[PDB]
Amino acid sequence: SKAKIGIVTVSDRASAGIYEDISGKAIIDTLNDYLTSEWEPIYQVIPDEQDVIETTLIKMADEQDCCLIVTTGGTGPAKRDVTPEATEAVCDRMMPGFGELMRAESLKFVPTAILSRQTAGLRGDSLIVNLPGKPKSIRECLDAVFPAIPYCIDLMEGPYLECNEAVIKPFRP
Amino acid sequence: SKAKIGIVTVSDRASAGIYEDISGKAIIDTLNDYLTSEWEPIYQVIPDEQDVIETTLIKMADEQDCCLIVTTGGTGPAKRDVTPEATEAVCDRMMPGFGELMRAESLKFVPTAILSRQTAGLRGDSLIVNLPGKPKSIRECLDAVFPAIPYCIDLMEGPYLECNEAVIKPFRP
Amino acid sequence: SKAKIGIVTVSDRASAGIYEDISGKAIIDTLNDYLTSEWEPIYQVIPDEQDVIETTLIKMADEQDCCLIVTTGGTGPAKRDVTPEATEAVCDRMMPGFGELMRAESLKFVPTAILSRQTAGLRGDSLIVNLPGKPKSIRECLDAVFPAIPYCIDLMEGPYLECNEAVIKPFRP
């Protein structure tokens, strides 16, 4: 089948209106650079509301057959930040290695990396990954974890993602 | 706002007034070396009864306005070690990066650091962090995570902690 | 007293009929290489059926007095990979530092290590640790965490395990 990839920008400010969604743009730019195979971006901007996040992810995974869903925003210690809660609530099983690696990688830049509650889990055969907010952090997190994603999707019997190996090298054992 | 920092020593020999608490003292000494801003320790020595640990953390967070609460003791694989369980019970959202980093740093010279179930989380605007009992493990764990703590407290709209940069360098993005 | 160690090969394929269980064999071979003290393998090969895994782990811990139980297989993101779910189910407290270290060490070879949901935890005084199926990965994970295992067993008041320190050095603080 053809790959559907969800992109969820979680932000009160973006939902109120911003000049440009630089976080969401950073994701689609990076994914376009990664992928040679055809794919369909399923994009949504939503507020920091746990229930709305959950609803969004559920539709993308269940109805829209998204094999991957990447979120940006709402992963810090602030009370409004509930993307990880929403993610835990919708996944059947978590992927501890992703949160581990993303923080380890982010800590190479900033001591405050350990304040991120970014996680990842599976809802059926969809992989959902929580990314940071800043465009450069987004690319740093994706460069770190995406090498494992096409294989993860393979094991989940999902679409076979083909990458521009001039940009990123998926590992497939 | 003057910063109030909770210090909780959990110990099976602590109904004894003659217990010398070298762990609590290590926390106090470390924080004294770290901080240049004024702060106030709210200090309790308690038995390793999960119920009592929970009541203590809740009081310090809900009543006594502790911006940060640091526990020592009761984090290992022994059946009586229930400090993590108490911590999970009172926190409304967990901070997985703290336990990850504390073990990662500690295991380099103490392989048995991986046996610590130490964790961290947030109760409202209070950051709660589990340390091991041994003073050297205490300094090591605080050195690894404290650089992220002033900014976490900033994001919580708590007091503004300042540090002696020759001893420890908090990061603020 | 006399050390009993559970070895569980989790594999639909092996359970169906296989010339040799290389996964289970890798574990036995590794332990024999590590230990100089007398120990008894409690060995079972079972399919990828969560209820079966849980039943097996419970028996090994509660009935068979296994101080350590090591699983191989079923830790990835595939539909039928349910070994970590079973381990979570039967353990009363988790040991997050094991999965962290195993993944972190594995990541130094192959970026897909982040796809393992391998975990570890305690059921009563039994330590249960998830390994991947591949024999090379089994030995790498064991090399990473075994140095902390004899001490953990000491803390849980179990058998005193002694090692060939020419192969592996248990750390006992």
Query: What one-character-per-residue DSSP string does B84-105 give?
Result: HHHHHHH-SEE-HHHHHHHHHH
Cα distance between residue A102 and residue A138, in whole Å: 10
For chain B, the 3-state helix, strand and coil shares in percent, each to the nearest 5, are: 40, 20, 40
Task: Kindly determine whether residue C151 and residue B112, on different chains, have CB atoms separated by under 8 Å.
Answer: yes
Q: Find out whether B115 and C155 touch, Cβ atoms under 8 Å.
A: yes
Give me Rg for the CA atoms of chain C: 15
Q: Which residues contact B114 (CB under 8 A, 6 or more apart)?
A: B103, B107, C95, C97, C98, C100, C101, C145, C148
B3-10 and B39-46 beta bridge pairing: parallel
Task: Kindly determine whether residue B114 and residue C94, on different chains, have CB atoms separated by under 8 Å.
Answer: no
Kindly state the tokens that stand for B25. Answer: 């003292």
How distant is the Cα of C85 from the closest Cα of chain A, in angstroms? 8
Interface test with B, best of A75, A98, A110, A115 (most B CBs within 10 A): A115
Q: Which chains touch A (3 or more CB pairs under 8 A)?
A: B, C
Contact residues on chain A for B124, CB-CB shorter than 8 A:
79
Interface of B with C in 125-154 (CB under 8 A): none
Contact residues on chain A for C76, CB-CB shorter than 8 A:
155
From the list C57, C61, C30, C54, the residue with the least C-alpha distance to C164 is C30
From the list C75, C90, C101, C162, the residue with the least C-alpha distance to C126 is C90
Contact residues on chain B for A117, CB-CB shorter than 8 A:
93-97
Q: Report the chain C residue with the minimal C-alpha distance to residue A93.
A: C85
Between B93, B101, B169, which is nearest A117 by CB? Answer: B93
Cα distance between residue B120 and residue B57, in whole Å: 12
Contact residues on chain B for A115, CB-CB shorter than 8 A:
95, 97, 148, 151-152, 155
Give me Rg for the CA atoms of chain A: 15
Task: Kindly determine whether residue C112 and residue A148, on different chains, have CB atoms separated by under 8 Å.
Answer: yes
Interface of C with A in 76-95 (CB under 8 A): 76-79, 84-85
Q: Is A138 left (phi over 0), alpha (psi -120 to 50) or beta?
A: alpha
Solving technique for this entry?
X-ray
How distant is the Cα of B117 from the closest Cα of chain C, in angstroms? 6
Interface of A with C in 20-59 (CB under 8 A): none
Between A127, A148, A157, which is nearest C111 by CB? Answer: A148
Cα distance between residue B23 and residue B138, in whole Å: 8
Task: Kindly determine whether residue A84 and residue B93, on different chains, have CB atoms separated by under 8 Å.
Answer: yes
How distant is the Cα of B73 from the closest Cα of chain C, in angstroms? 14
Q: Which ranges of chain B would DSSP assign to H, the alpha helix?
A: 22-34, 50-62, 83-90, 96-107, 135-145, 149-155
Cα distance between residue A145 and residue A168, in whole Å: 11
C120-123 and C93-94 beta bridge pairing: antiparallel
Q: Find out whether A110 and A118 touch, Cβ atoms under 8 Å.
A: no
Q: Which chains touch B (3 or more CB pairs under 8 A)?
A: A, C
How distant is the Cα of A113 from the closest Cα of chain C, in angstroms? 17
Contact residues on chain A for C110, CB-CB shorter than 8 A:
171, 173
Q: Which residues contact C80 (CB under 8 A, 6 or more apart)?
A: C12, C48, C74
Q: Report the chain C residue with the minimal C-alpha distance to residue A150.
A: C112
Question: What are the distances in angstroms from CA A9 to CA A31, A39, A127, C130, C151?
Answer: 15, 19, 16, 35, 46
B75 touches chain C (CB under 8 A): no
In C17-171, at which residue ranges do the beta strands (DSSP E only) sit? Answer: 39-46, 68-72, 93-94, 120-123, 126-131
Cα distance between residue B137 and residue B112, in whole Å: 11
Q: Find out whether C2 and C38 touch, Cβ atoms under 8 Å.
A: yes
Neighbouring CB atoms inside 10 A of C157's CB total 10
- The residue behind tokens 């940071």 is A132
- Domains of chain B in sequence order: 1-173 (3.40.980.10)
- Which helix (H) or strand (E) segment holds residue C9: the answer is strand C3-10
From the list B106, B109, B116, B110, the residue with the least C-alpha distance to B145 is B106
Q: In DSSP terms, which residues pair with A99 in a beta bridge? A: none
Contact residues on chain C for A100, CB-CB shorter than 8 A:
100, 103-104, 114
Distance, C-alpha B32 to centroid of its chain: 14
